[PDB]
Design a protein around this nucleic acid. Structure first.
Ligand SMILES: *C[C@@](*)(O)[C@H](CCCNC(N)=[NH2+])NC(=O)[C@@H]1CCCN1C(=O)[C@H](N)Cc1ccccc1
Ligand SMILES: *[C@@H]1O[C@H](CO)[C@@H](O)[C@H](O)[C@H]1NC(C)=O
Ligand SMILES: [K+]
Ligand code: NA
Lengths: 249, 28
DNA sequence: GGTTGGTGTGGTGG
């Protein structure tokens, strides 16, 4: 996260850390959607151009964390994965279309002041809140600049209209993506960056006070560049696939 | 069920330090 | 202690 700040304790209790077993390192963010299911970006698990291809046994998830690196004894929960589910039409070759994956924990996690699931949006909530100029919030332990933090970072960013997103990049945008970020002379800055993928872009409903995950950190070109925007997987548009995997498996 | 409500914030009627920015984007 | 124990500097920083 570029130009963000340190998260408060328990500010993002659905934030999950995807951690590699060997070598021991942070891979990506992720989000807690139920006591057994964690959502992330597909590219965090499968990206053949970088020779990335993880199995359920290569990974742990770390739930409840604040510190990037230190083991937060009796606060965080480290869970092994039962199974990973990558969208069958995840398009890693072209533009990361449908950059989405589900991870089923072996055992359910107990909720706490530090661990609590985020809501997934329905049609009513997405129509209402996912509008250009409204702001959401992104969180992660990824880089502080294009190349980092001691603790989880947060930044709030405005949703950008589809035309501007489309014009800001030569990558082909799809309806399974949105972009967010300040325009070049808008008065503020900020962005997700490498290492923040799979983290949630959330919005607070002013009608029922709940947080909804509208996006997944998916991709950008550099970080916090003028005239460029962060791209996010559009969770609502992929919600049928989410529901099918959870209902089946 | 009680998704999206934070024990240390919503549940305690406490605001985090920047959430007001979010709510303002909806109404100025 | 702490966002958390204790033959308490490591197991994971100080
Ligand atoms: C895996 C994530 O940590 C990362 C998030 C980067 C977010 N950036 C900004 N500015 N918000 N995603 C990536 O690094 C993805 C994975 C593959 C390459 N990639 C990129 O973002 C490239 N920089 C651009 C790109 C290349 C290929 C296909 C789509 C995008
Ligand atoms: C990823 O790895 C699995 C084995 O874990 C293998 O079956 C497959 O060849 C790989 N998939 C891709 C798309 O490279
Ligand atoms: K200690
Ligand atoms: Na930008």
């Amino acid at each position: 996260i570029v130009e963000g700040s340190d998260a408060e304790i328990g500010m993002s209790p659905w934030q999950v850390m995807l951690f590699r077993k060997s070598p021991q390192e942070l891979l990506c963010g992720a989000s807690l959607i139920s006591d057994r299911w964690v959502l992330t970006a597909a590219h965090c698990l499968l990206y053949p151009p970088w020779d990335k291809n993880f199995t359920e046994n290569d990974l742990l998830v770390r739930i409840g964390k604040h510190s990037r690196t230190r083991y937060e004894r009796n606060i965080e929960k480290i869970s092994m994965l039962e199974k990973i589910y990558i969208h069958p039409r995840y398009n890693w070759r072209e533009n990361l279309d449908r950059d989405i994956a589900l991870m089923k924990l072996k055992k359910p996690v107990a909720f706490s002041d530090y661990i609590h699931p985020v809501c997934l949006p329905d049609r009513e909530t997405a129509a209402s809140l996912l509008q250009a100029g409204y702001k959401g919030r992104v969180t992660g332990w990824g880089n502080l600049k294009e190349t980092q933090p001691s603790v989880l970072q947060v930044v709030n960013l405005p949703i950008v209209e589809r035309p501007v997103c489309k014009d800001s990049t030569r990558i082909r945008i799809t309806d399974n993506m949105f972009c967010a970020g300040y325009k070049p002379d808008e008065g503020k800055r900020g962005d997700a960056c490498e290492g923040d993928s799979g983290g949630p872009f959330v919005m607070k409903s002013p009608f029922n006070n709940r947080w909804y995950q509208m996006g997944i950190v998916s991709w950008g070109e550099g970080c916090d560049r003028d005239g460029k925007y962060g791209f996010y997987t559009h969770v609502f548009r992929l919600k049928k696939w989410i529901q099918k995997v959870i209902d089946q498996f | 069920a009680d998704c999206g409500l934070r024990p240390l914030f919503e549940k305690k009627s406490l605001e985090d330090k920047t959430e007001r920015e979010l709510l303002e984007s909806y109404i100025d």
